[PDB]
Copies of this chain bind each other. A is one copy, B any other.
Amino acid sequence: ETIVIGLAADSGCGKSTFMRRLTSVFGGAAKPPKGGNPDSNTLISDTTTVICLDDYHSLDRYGRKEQKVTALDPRANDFDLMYEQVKALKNGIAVEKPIYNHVTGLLDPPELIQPPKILVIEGLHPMFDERVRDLLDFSIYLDISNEVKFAWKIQRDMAERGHSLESIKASIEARKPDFDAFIDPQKQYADAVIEVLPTTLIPDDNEGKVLRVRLIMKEGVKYFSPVYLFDEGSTISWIPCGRKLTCSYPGIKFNYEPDSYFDHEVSVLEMDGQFDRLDELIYVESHLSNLSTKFYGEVTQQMLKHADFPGSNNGTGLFQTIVGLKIRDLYEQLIANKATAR
The interface-forming segment of A62-70, A230-238, A265-273 is A62-70
A106 at the interface (CB under 8 A from B): yes
Residues of A within 8 Å of B, CB-based: how many?
25
Is the beta-carbon distance between A112 and B80 smaller than 8 angstroms? yes
- Return chain B residues, CB-CB under 8 Å to A63: 78, 81, 98
Is the beta-carbon distance between A80 and B62 smaller than 8 angstroms? yes
B-contact bits for A53-86, CB 8 A (1 contact / 0 none):
0000111101100110000000100101100100
Separation of A60 and B78 alpha carbons in the complex (Å): 12
Is the beta-carbon distance between B110 and A93 smaller than 8 angstroms? yes
Name 21 A/B residue pairs within 8 A (Cβ), A-sorted: A58-B96, A58-B110, A59-B98, A59-B110, A60-B81, A62-B78, A63-B78, A63-B81, A63-B98, A66-B78, A66-B107, A78-B96, A78-B110, A78-B112, A80-B112, A81-B112, A84-B106, A84-B107, A93-B109, A94-B98, A94-B110
CB closest residue in chain B, given A63: B81
Separation of A304 and B189 alpha carbons in the complex (Å): 61
A95 at the interface (CB under 8 A from B): yes
Expressed in whole angstroms, the minimum distance between the Cβ of A39 and any Cβ of chain B is 15
CB closest residue in chain B, given A96: B58
Give 7 nearest A-B pairs by CB, closest first: A58-B96, A75-B109, A58-B110, A93-B109, A67-B107, A58-B66, A78-B96
B-contact bits for A147-167, CB 8 A (1 contact / 0 none):
000000000000000000000
Q: Tell me the A residues contacting B by CB distance below 8 Å.
A: 57-60, 62-63, 66-67, 75, 78, 80-81, 84, 88, 91, 93-96, 98, 106-107, 109-110, 112
Separation of A315 and B318 alpha carbons in the complex (Å): 78
Separation of A320 and B32 alpha carbons in the complex (Å): 48
CB closest residue in chain B, given A106: B84
Expressed in whole angstroms, the minimum distance between the Cβ of A63 and any Cβ of chain B is 6
Separation of A67 and B75 alpha carbons in the complex (Å): 14
Is the beta-carbon distance between A107 and B95 smaller than 8 angstroms? yes
Separation of A62 and B80 alpha carbons in the complex (Å): 9
Expressed in whole angstroms, the minimum distance between the Cβ of A187 and any Cβ of chain B is 25
Separation of A98 and B66 alpha carbons in the complex (Å): 11
CB < 8 Å: which of B81, B88, B95 contacts A62? B81
- Return chain B residues, CB-CB under 8 Å to A66: 58, 78, 107
Separation of A98 and B107 alpha carbons in the complex (Å): 13
